[PDB]
Write a protein that binds this ligand. Structure first.
Ligand SMILES: NC1CCN(Cc2ccn3ncnc(Oc4ccc(NC(=O)NC(=O)Cc5ccc(F)cc5)cc4F)c23)CC1
Length: 290
């Protein structure tokens, strides 16, 4: 029972929130266990009673409160944006259950290992070149899926990719100038080819085990830096063929950049050549760098 006129939302718009709803008669939320509140909502640990037995772990997403109906359609329209995202490498929506008491919730599958960036930066973890390339391969597969749905991410980065118990990457979304294409920096226009550029930066984050891109650069003022004729350097443990792909992702002519289908293809080949014997270590010069 909220004190806001919600049905004044977008009928012939957000009516699909029903054929996706999952009655509270099966979802248990743990408001005491907070996994993390990014900035525009609190995320807790949750459980789902699948049908009449199967219980499953998950991450419940909720918002502040009354800042009007506008932001309620924003949190909903979005969660519904994931509804059609049926791909193993894309973070999906379990459903949306409604109490309407002052904060609707979106149910996501729990990601045991959190985000790809914190996971790889972890010194207790021991990824090989193969594992890191594999994570990158999984990201390209999800992006290949998203591009096919004509969905432009606009914010692809290791911090936005989630990792689950089976080590399956789920591309997700929790101005990032350092991941932006030259043409986007200049004309604020985002495209799939601009995601490919961000994917090239993401591969660099992976091979550097989460070092921040261009530490030394003004940020913004990245445009002037790139225009001087610069790109991120090849990480120590990055295979040449992979750096070559990174260089392609950062092509000056967007249309000249490989598609995500080509990226999956190219990267699956590179990945196939490694056996898991080359361990990737952290770079002394990147450590502690923000
Ligand atoms: N970097 C942060 C740090 C905290 N961490 C919280 C966390 C830990 C474990 N989990 N498990 C699940 N979910 C956890 O948080 C969340 C992680 C992602 C989302 N995403 C959305 O709400 N929406 C989308 O992703 C939309 C979208 C989907 C696909 C796209 F290609 C583009 C956009 C919501 C969360 F709540 C969590 C998290 C990553």
């Amino acid at each position: 029972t909220v004190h806001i006129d919600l049905s004044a939302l977008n009928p012939e718009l957000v009516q699909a929130v029903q054929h996706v709803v999952i009655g509270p008669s099966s979802l248990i939320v743990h408001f005491n266990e907070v996994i993390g509140r990014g900035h525009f909502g609190c995320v807790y640990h949750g459980t789902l009673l699948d049908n009449d037995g199967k219980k499953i772990h998950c991450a419940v997403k909720s918002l502040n409160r009354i800042t009007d109906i506008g932001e309620v359609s924003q949190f909903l329209t979005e969660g519904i944006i994931m509804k059609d995202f049926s791909h193993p490498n894309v973070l999906s929506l379990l459903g949306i259950c409604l109490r309407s008491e002052g904060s609707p919730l979106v149910v996501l599958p729990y990601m045991k290992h959190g985000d790809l960036r914190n996971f790889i930066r972890n010194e207790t973890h021991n990824p090989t070149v193969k594992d890191l390339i594999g994570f990158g391969l999984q990201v390209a597969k999800g992006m290949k899926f998203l591009a096919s749905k004509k969905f432009v991410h606009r914010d692809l980065a290791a911090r936005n990719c989630m990792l689950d118990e089976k080590f399956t990457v789920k591309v997700a979304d929790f101005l990032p100038v350092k991941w932006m294409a030259l043409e986007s920096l200049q004309t604020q226009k985002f495209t799939t080819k601009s995601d490919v550029w961000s994917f090239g930066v993401l591969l660099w984050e992976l091979m550097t085990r989460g070092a921040p891109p261009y530490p030394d650069v003004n940020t913004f003022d990245i445009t002037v830096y790139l225009l001087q004729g610069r790109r991120l350097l090849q990480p120590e443990y990055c295979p040449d063929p992979l750096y070559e792909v990174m260089l392609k992702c950062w092509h000056p002519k967007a249309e000249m950049r490989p598609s995500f289908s080509e990226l999956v293809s190219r990267i699956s080949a590179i990945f196939s050549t490694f056996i898991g014997e080359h361990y990737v270590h952290v770079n002394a010069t990147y450590v502690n760098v923000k």
